[PDB]
Swiss-Prot record, chain D:
Residues 18-62 form a coiled coil. The gene is S. This is Spike protein S2'. It comes from Severe acute respiratory syndrome coronavirus 2. The chain holds residues 932 to 1029 of 1273 of the full protein. Subunit of the fusion protein that is processed upon entry into the host cell. Mediates fusion of the virion and cellular membranes by functioning as a class I viral fusion protein. Contains a viral fusion peptide that is unmasked after S2 cleavage. This cleavage can occur at the cell membrane by host TMPRSS2 or during endocytosis by host CSTL. In either case, this triggers an extensive and irreversible conformational change that leads to fusion of the viral envelope with the cellular cytoplasmic membrane, releasing viral genomic RNA into the host cell cytoplasm. Changing N38K: In strain: Omicron/BA.1, Omicron/BA.2, Omicron/BA.2.12.1, Omicron/BA.2.75, Omicron/BA.4, Omicron/BA.5, Omicron/BQ.1.1, Omicron/XBB.1.5, Omicron/EG.5.1.
From Swiss-Prot, chain E:
This is Spike protein S2'. Subunit of the fusion protein that is processed upon entry into the host cell. Mediates fusion of the virion and cellular membranes by functioning as a class I viral fusion protein. Contains a viral fusion peptide that is unmasked after S2 cleavage. This cleavage can occur at the cell membrane by host TMPRSS2 or during endocytosis by host CSTL. In either case, this triggers an extensive and irreversible conformational change that leads to fusion of the viral envelope with the cellular cytoplasmic membrane, releasing viral genomic RNA into the host cell cytoplasm. Glycans are attached at N7, N31. It comes from Severe acute respiratory syndrome coronavirus 2 (2019-nCoV).
Length: 96, 133, 273, 98, 35
């Protein structure tokens, strides 16, 4: 007796406010509410040895890879930069 | 920085409602904030007037708002219904009452007058006693 | 807001005129006048579609965004900022302006002794918006480029299908028709290489633009949180001058904030101690 | 006056600016160094490829050269776009602080 | 200690309020000397 229904979404319970040029609403009681809020601060540091990944333990492959210029160095530098930025994030968040 | 090491007046930045304080907590690759906030709960209706004209002059609340339950007028703080007698200490005068739209008539109690009247009654009793010898 | 507020039928706002930012029922959608001008001022394809490039409709249709904007504006005008922090509390709009003036360090009496004037300026001020947005077109440029770029890249992504990338012919059907399998492969694979580089570039550009738009949308959400649902003491955040209040308005792929602010006008010299 | 002592003595204080410059220079320098790699072609200088090889056989090495160099510019442009986004974030923070 | 202070009178609202009472008291005394 359960089924998949499709419908126009409801924006919220309509609530007309009794506005008046001389009417005021003032609370006589309060609630102290605690709300949780989750925020990512960092991510797992990763390092990829470009030569090891592309040409694992093969010198014939490394000879061809070295013809491609500084691509592997650029990738390694980018990943080390990300790794350093992770610790910088953690320091600036938690070490106040 | 704003929510934990202090209190933020920014609306809906440190949790919903009027922010009171906050708690940081660690989490796997992240942080969890417990925002402790004040939220008004039970509102009541009142008849309000932007000003009060008592001695020809207009009166405005130093802090809060004017309210009336239909029979008496009080001044109360904005976010909590704590009515108090309209006194010269709680209000300030600004001009007369012909230009303010929506001003209403209500007496403004001045705490100095009862003290002076008690002193005057004491003085009158002392005079009457002095007429006896 | 979890609640959709409705403006009261009577419009006794103490002289303040919101008929230009509130929705009007004459329109089949609940848009206001300024929002309706904004949707016309921004120009919001098949040949893109047949190559596998599909545009998806937004989750919230413009009618729902207009409803949300109307609810926010009604809450702002009938309850001040109290509807953002919790239960919605009705309050006369003149008293709300007195609250705002008290917020900016001006004693509230200054409002009441000048209310008829302050309305007449504000009612005129909103009117100046109508003249401003209807005459000049570059004002909404902040949105137009956001459209054009997304179009332009798409067009470029289509144009990349016309390149040879070293193959003898730029049409895959032509390659299949003229060449046998072993020799057709050496052209087809070049075609995949080039077109896959093209999609790599397009997806990277889209990711970067999406990050920029996410930053801008987070800024817009922040401005909605403080400027609209409250009053911001941050200097030059919610408009120029001492911020008083704000109005959100929808627009094609964007939001328009009308920041109503207090600006001192005529000053006199005095000797101070 | 203490600032006068702080900035004039140590140099790492302005590091948050220096790393902005150096990276760009490095991002340029590597982009220049990419012109020295063969990318599989028999010679790195395109003039050598044109001089030693006829217009039929030269094309296969030249195409390798364009492939490699265009990939290099694509990487450089992507890195520049990401760095420009970061600098825009820092500039917006600076504008807010102002 | 304050630099730039200037001389000016500061009006206390209690002084005239008490001075009116003083004049009323003086008139009452003078009237009491009449019978």
């Amino acid at each position: 007796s359960q089924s998949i229904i499709a419908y126009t979404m409801s924006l919220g319970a309509e609530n007309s406010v009794a506005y008046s040029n001389n009417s005021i609403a003032i609370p006589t009681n309060f609630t102290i509410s605690v709300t949780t809020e989750i925020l990512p601060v960092s991510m797992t540091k990763t390092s990829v040895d470009c030569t090891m990944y592309i040409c694992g333990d093969s010198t014939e492959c490394s000879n061809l890879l070295l013809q491609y210029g500084s691509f592997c160095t650029q990738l390694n530098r980018a990943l080390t930069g990300i790794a350093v930025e992770q610790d910088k994030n953690t320091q600036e968040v938690f070490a106040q | 920085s704003e929510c934990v090491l202090g209190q933020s007046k920014r609306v809906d930045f440190c949790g919903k409602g009027y922010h009171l304080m906050s708690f940081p907590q660690s989490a796997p690759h992240g942080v969890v904030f417990l925002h402790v906030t004040y939220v008004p709960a039970q509102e009541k209706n009142f008849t309000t007037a932007p000003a009060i004209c008592h001695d020809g002059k207009a009166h405005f609340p130093r802090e809060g708002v004017f309210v009336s339950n239909g029979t008496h007028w009080f001044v109360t703080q904005r976010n909590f219904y704590e009515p108090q007698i309209i006194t010269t200490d709680n209000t300030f005068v600004s001009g007369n009452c012909d230009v303010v739209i929506g001003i209403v008539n209500n007496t403004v109690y001045d705490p100095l007058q009862p003290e002076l009247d008690s002193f005057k009654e004491e003085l009158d009793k002392y005079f009457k006693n002095h007429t006896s010898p | 807001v979890k609640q959709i507020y409705k403006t009261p039928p009577i419009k006794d706002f103490g002289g303040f005129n919101f008929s230009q930012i509130l929705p009007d029922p004459s329109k089949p959608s609940k848009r206001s006048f300024i929002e309706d001008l904004l949707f016309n001022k921004v120009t919001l394809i098949c040949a893109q579609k047949f190559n596998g490039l599909t545009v998806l409709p937004p989750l919230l249709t413009d009618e729902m965004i207009a409803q949300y904007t109307s609810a926010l504006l009604a809450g702002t005008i009938t309850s001040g900022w109290t509807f953002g922090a919790g239960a919605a509390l009705q309050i006369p709009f003149a008293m709300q302006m007195a609250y705002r003036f008290n917020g900016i360090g001006v004693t509230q009496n200054v409002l009441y002794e000048n209310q008829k004037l302050i309305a007449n300026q504000f009612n005129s001020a909103i009117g100046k918006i109508q003249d401003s947005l209807s005459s000049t077109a570059s004002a909404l440029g902040k949105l137009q480029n956001v459209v054009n770029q997304n179009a332009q890249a798409l067009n470029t992504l289509v144009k990349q299908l016309s390149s040879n990338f070293g193959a003898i012919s730029s049409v895959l059907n032509d390659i299949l028709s003229r060449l046998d399998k072993v020799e057709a492969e050496v052209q087809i694979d070049r075609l995949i290489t080039g077109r896959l580089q093209s999609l790599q570039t397009y997806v990277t550009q889209q990711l970067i633009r999406a990050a920029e738009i996410r930053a801008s949308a987070n800024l817009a959400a922040t401005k909605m949180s403080e400027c609209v649902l409250g009053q911001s003491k941050r200097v030059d955040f919610c408009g120029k001058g001492y911020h008083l209040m704000s109005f959100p308005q929808s627009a094609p792929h964007g939001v328009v904030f009308l920041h109503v602010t207090y600006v001192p006008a005529q000053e006199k010299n005095f000797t101070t101690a």
